[PDB]
Swiss-Prot record, chain C:
Assigned protein family: Belongs to the bacterial ribosomal protein bL36 family.
Assembly notes: Component of the mitochondrial large ribosomal subunit (mt-LSU). Mature yeast 74S mitochondrial ribosomes consist of a small (37S) and a large (54S) subunit. The 37S small subunit contains a 15S ribosomal RNA (15S mt-rRNA) and 34 different proteins. The 54S large subunit contains a 21S rRNA (21S mt-rRNA) and 46 different proteins. bL36m has a zinc binding site.
Source organism of this protein record: Saccharomyces cerevisiae (strain ATCC 204508 / S288c) (Baker's yeast)
Localization in the cell: Mitochondrion
Function statement: Component of the mitochondrial ribosome (mitoribosome), a dedicated translation machinery responsible for the synthesis of mitochondrial genome-encoded proteins, including at least some of the essential transmembrane subunits of the mitochondrial respiratory chain. The mitoribosomes are attached to the mitochondrial inner membrane and translation products are cotranslationally integrated into the membrane. bL36m may be involved in a process influencing telomere capping.
Record's miscellaneous remark: Present with 500 molecules/cell in log phase SD medium.
Protein name as it appears in the record: Large ribosomal subunit protein bL36m
RNA sequence: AGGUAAAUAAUCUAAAGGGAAACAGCCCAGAUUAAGAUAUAAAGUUCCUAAUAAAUAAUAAGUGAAAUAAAUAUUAAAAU
RNA sequence: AAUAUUUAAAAUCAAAUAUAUAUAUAUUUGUUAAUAGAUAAUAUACGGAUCUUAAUAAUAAGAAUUAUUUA
RNA sequence: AGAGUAGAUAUUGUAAGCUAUGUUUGCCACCUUCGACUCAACAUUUCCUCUUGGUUGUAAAAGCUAAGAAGGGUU
RNA sequence: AAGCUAAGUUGAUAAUAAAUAAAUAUUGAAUACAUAUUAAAUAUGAAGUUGUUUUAAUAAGAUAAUUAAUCUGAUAAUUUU
């Protein structure tokens, strides 16, 4: 009886935004939160046989928080398959070569279930080092929360793009 | 020793909680066994159940097993034991002359409360 | 230079040193006293 | 601690002031954290120097007697006291530099060993023995002159810079244990081994 | 005339920061590269002749590379492409062979249909030659070094001996039918597989080669030929890219 | 010595299920057939993976986090 | 503060409990940490991700290690 | 301990002690081909090449010992 | 004779640059001294590392044409580049 009704809104791939400049969680703990919202556990309509994930946009990744000395000690491995060609890159090298978004993407990828939906769930995670992203308008906005935003700033974000 | 019995040498915090609970349950069984004897003796003297429970004098057990099980020196209560004795047992062929309690077979059921004074 | 797990002070001029996650010894009086904790 | 407790006598010609940073760097560490949100600008007749002191360090001022005292909010923490002593030492060194000027004497003892200034004094050419031109450029804030080829005098407002440059020159040929030969940063001496020539 | 639109504060109030530069980027990669400062030429190898020096009599093999209608077609810039290069065309070709799309592309750049087209990457704008300017053998100077690049001669399925210089097996002393084989190819059951890259029979040739530091010993435009000492990869009538040597000057 | 010979107890042999990643012999717990409401055992509760919040101290080594590697040396902390 | 020993609830001290009960007797419990030493062959191997927190500041994080505990 | 002109720790290091590897000779029985030719891949406990510390026993040159180093080479 | 070859000819050992291991230093307190820091600041340092050069693979991007009697491919024929 509870299932009968308009179910379209429930299965809507909303877009969430996390600003690492304001968020105070570390890399691992933030990754765990991002994985849960990508899997869809936050939705009461979730079933393991369905991909109910929601797009997650992460900005200002350069202010990520890594504790200890992992930034220069943690090693990322990638083996082609031939003996003697194992590559061990430290986190410092990876971010300098690809970016801070890849650290989050790598962390989230492990959290995701090892299913056929892993790759589809990972691409839903968009990570940007800075604040400039093409998905600025692709976020959950509400009428009752536009009072705080000044009009000149609002117009710049909407019309003035790229 | 090729076959892998991956039994760790330390317990998790959750195993320790369960061990403390199991010791308390055994003590509560002993506490209840004595209580029944005290109440039964009091009823034999003529008293009723209620006054027996409220009697100032508590008849101590006379059997050897129950008398010793009520001695803290012989069978200490959980709140009386040391942390080492709660989680560690005595083995004479181990470094430190101690080994994890969880390595004792059927440790959940068997009761080992006393260890040698200096070991 | 002496690479030993046991580093000791012989000369009254040796001084212990903590660097690169290791213990060093240097003696201005005599250079044979130099050792590293390895 | 004890070094940081020493009074600091400031002459009238040398003025010392504390300021604040518009961009406070926050360098992270283990269980302890550090924040730098203040600046000290020591000024005197012989140039001026600046230091970025930590936020948890404040300078007490007393016009009478020209005495200034450096204090920290909590001296119990090891990190604070360690920084307290270092800050005390350096500001004193900056003050001494801007009022008198630090000096370094480089002495060459080997035969044919000498230093000649090139590029209108900007370059120091060392001749401690080699088939390749050897020398390093003088940095900003360091003035180098050579009273004689054998000797050399180096001065500047920063004690750390002048001695680092002098030490860098020394690395070309440190003193030899057998016959004294090389560059001497100061009056330091090297014990000569016996002349047991085989 | 304002369309409806709503903004979430999560990005309206966010501070503005510029993403740092990453090595995986055309900008950083271009700055790391080792590129020459001048454009190049497309040539067709016509053969090889002896070059007799008239002052000392030394006889050195020289391969003749002709230039025919070598014209610059269009440019490539960092702002729109990420690298600096000069597209160069060679030769002339009948309209019946060139695709309609390509014939339009050439017309847009006011050039003839061309036998070949190639790019010569350069260090910066200063090396970009204006489009439509014809290029001559005089573009190179006597006695300077250039790098040649061409597809090598085909050789078909070539065995281990001819491909990697394997010494094969004994030719006598009881050897069985297997003489021209490499012998072993792995270990016994530890890897359980032939490791990748194992040297093995295959096809060699029709492959790109880059001979470096080839010396120019005669430049003349009245015959439309360039003389370069030595050998240039490829067969009769094979396109060769000449450009200033990066290693030697 | 995953060796050999006996003594006591349990399990496998002939034992499903949960836990120890995988696991004949270890910790629980023994399958008549259903259902699935409630208690649960061992074991767990950041995500993969069903489930959590706290109190007091120590660690700065990623030591450690489900298979503890020793004599000794260094640094530091308490008591006499 | 310097120097020389040990790292101990045995003795002593503190606390809790059972009896005679304002006290005494008896029983029980409470005494260091980090690093180096540190070691081989297809490939990093806590099962993997990953785990140590940060005021300006978020509806909101601050061991997911070790030791003793609570709900 | 003892040699090292002097001095145990430049170099050497009796006999006993604590360990690491599974490269030799063994032990258990869960499990019934040495050498040569060809091609080699991997480790470093580094033979040469590169940087460095010690060497009354580093005057120079050759050397001894030790640390970082597996990119190239090793009839 | 052409072709193929090496016993022959030509070239290459891939710079510049960045951070580094052992090691050599400046200032400097915690700890009046000393201490290159397992404190904050400042420098050197290897045939190694990142890179660079070279080959192979995908094609982000770019120029142009877009119902065709000389738009794009393939089948078909004469062939070796
Ligand atoms: Mg042969
Ligand atoms: Mg034959
Ligand atoms: Mg075989
Ligand atoms: Mg047996
Ligand atoms: Mg049977
Ligand atoms: Mg079973
Ligand atoms: Mg049975
Ligand atoms: Mg049954
Ligand atoms: Mg670990
Ligand atoms: Mg587990
Ligand atoms: Mg006692
Ligand atoms: Mg491994
Ligand atoms: Mg002697
Ligand atoms: Mg011996
Ligand atoms: Mg080594
Ligand atoms: Mg010599
Ligand atoms: Mg290299
Ligand atoms: Mg040659
Ligand atoms: Mg001092
Ligand atoms: Mg010194
Ligand atoms: Mg180099």
């Amino acid at each position: 009886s509870q299932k009968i009704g308009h179910s379209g809104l429930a299965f809507a791939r909303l877009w969430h935004h996390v600003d690492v400049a304001r968020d105070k969680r570390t890399l691992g703990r933030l990754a765990s939160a991002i994985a849960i919202t990508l899997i869809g556990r936050h939705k009461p309509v979730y079933h393991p046989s369905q991909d109910c994930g929601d797009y997650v946009v992460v900005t200002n990744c350069q202010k990520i928080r890594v504790t200890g000395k992992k930034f220069e000690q943690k090693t990322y491995w990638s083996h082609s398959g031939r003996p003697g060609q194992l590559k061990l890159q430290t986190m410092n090298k990876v971010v300098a070569d690809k970016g801070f978004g890849e650290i989050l993407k790598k962390a989230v990828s492990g959290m995701l279930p090892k299913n056929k939906l892993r790759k589809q769930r990972l691409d839903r995670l968009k990570v940007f080092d800075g604040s400039e992203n093409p998905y600025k308008q692709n976020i959950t906005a509400f009428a009752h929360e536009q009072s705080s935003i000044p009009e000149p700033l609002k117009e710049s974000i909407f019309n003035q793009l790229k | 020793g090729g076959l892998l019995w991956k039994i760790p040498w330390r317990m998790s915090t959750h195993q320790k909680t369960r061990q403390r609970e199991r010791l308390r349950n055994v003590d509560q069984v002993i506490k209840q066994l004595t209580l029944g004897l005290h109440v039964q003796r009091c009823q034999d003297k003529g008293l009723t159940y209620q006054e027996a429970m409220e009697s100032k004098k508590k008849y101590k057990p006379r059997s050897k097993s129950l008398r010793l099980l009520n001695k803290p020196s012989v069978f200490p209560k959980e709140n009386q034991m040391s942390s080492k004795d709660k989680y560690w047992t005595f083995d004479k062929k181990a470094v430190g002359y101690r080994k994890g309690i969880h390595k004792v077979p059927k440790w959940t059921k068997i009761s080992i409360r006393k260890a040698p004074k200096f070991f | 230079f002496k690479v030993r797990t046991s580093v000791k002070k012989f000369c009254s001029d040796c001084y212990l040193v903590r660097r690169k996650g290791r213990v060093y010894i240097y003696c201005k009086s005599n250079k044979k006293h130099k050792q590293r904790q390895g | 601690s004890q070094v940081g407790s020493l009074p600091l006598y400031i002459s009238p010609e040398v003025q010392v002031s504390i300021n604040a940073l518009s961009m406070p760097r926050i360098i992270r560490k283990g269980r302890t954290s550090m924040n730098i949100s203040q600046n000290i600008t020591v000024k005197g007749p012989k140039g001026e120097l600046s230091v970025e002191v930590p936020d948890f360090l404040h300078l007490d001022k007393d016009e009478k007697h020209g005495k200034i005292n450096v204090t920290v909010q909590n001296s119990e923490d090891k990190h604070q006291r360690s920084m307290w002593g270092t800050v005390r030492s350096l500001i004193n060194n900056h003050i001494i530099g801007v009022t008198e000027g630090h000096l370094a004497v480089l002495r060459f003892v080997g035969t044919g060993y000498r230093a000649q200034l090139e590029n209108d004094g900007k370059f120091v050419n060392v001749k401690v023995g080699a088939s390749i031109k050897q020398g390093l450029d003088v940095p900003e804030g360091i003035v180098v002159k050579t009273p004689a080829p054998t000797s050399l005098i180096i001065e500047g407002c920063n004690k750390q810079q002048v001695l680092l440059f002098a030490a860098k020159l020394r690395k070309f040929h440190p003193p030899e244990p057998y016959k004294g030969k090389g560059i001497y940063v100061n009056d330091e001496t090297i014990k000569l081994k016996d002349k047991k020539i085989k | 005339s304002t369309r409806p639109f709503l903004v979430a504060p999560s990005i309206a109030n966010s501070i503005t920061t510029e993403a740092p530069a990453i090595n995986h980027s055309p900008e950083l990669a271009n700055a790391r590269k080792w590129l020459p400062k001048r454009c190049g030429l497309i040539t067709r190898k016509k053969g090889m002749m002896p070059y007799f020096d008239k002052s000392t009599g030394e006889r050195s093999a020289a391969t003749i590379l002709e230039v025919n209608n070598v014209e610059v077609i269009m440019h490539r810039t960092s702002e729109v492409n990420g690298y600096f290069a000069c597209q160069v065309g060679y030769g002339s070709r009948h309209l019946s062979k060139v695709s309609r799309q390509m014939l339009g592309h050439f017309a847009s750049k006011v050039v003839n249909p061309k036998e070949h087209v190639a790019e010569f990457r350069v260090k910066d704008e200063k090396g970009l030659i204006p489009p439509g300017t014809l290029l001559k053998p005089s573009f190179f100077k006597e006695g300077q070094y250039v790098d040649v690049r061409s597809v090598s001669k085909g050789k078909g399925f070539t065995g281990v001996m001819k491909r990697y210089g394997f010494k094969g097996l004994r030719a006598s002393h009881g050897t069985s039918i297997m003489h021209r084989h490499g012998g072993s190819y792995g270990q016994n059951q530890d890897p359980g597989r032939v490791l990748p890259g194992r040297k093995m029979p295959g096809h060699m040739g029709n492959e790109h080669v880059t001979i470096q530091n080839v010396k120019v010993l005669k430049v003349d435009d009245e015959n439309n030929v360039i003389w370069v000492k030595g050998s240039v990869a490829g067969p009769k009538n094979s396109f060769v890219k000449i450009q200033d040597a990066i290693k030697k000057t």
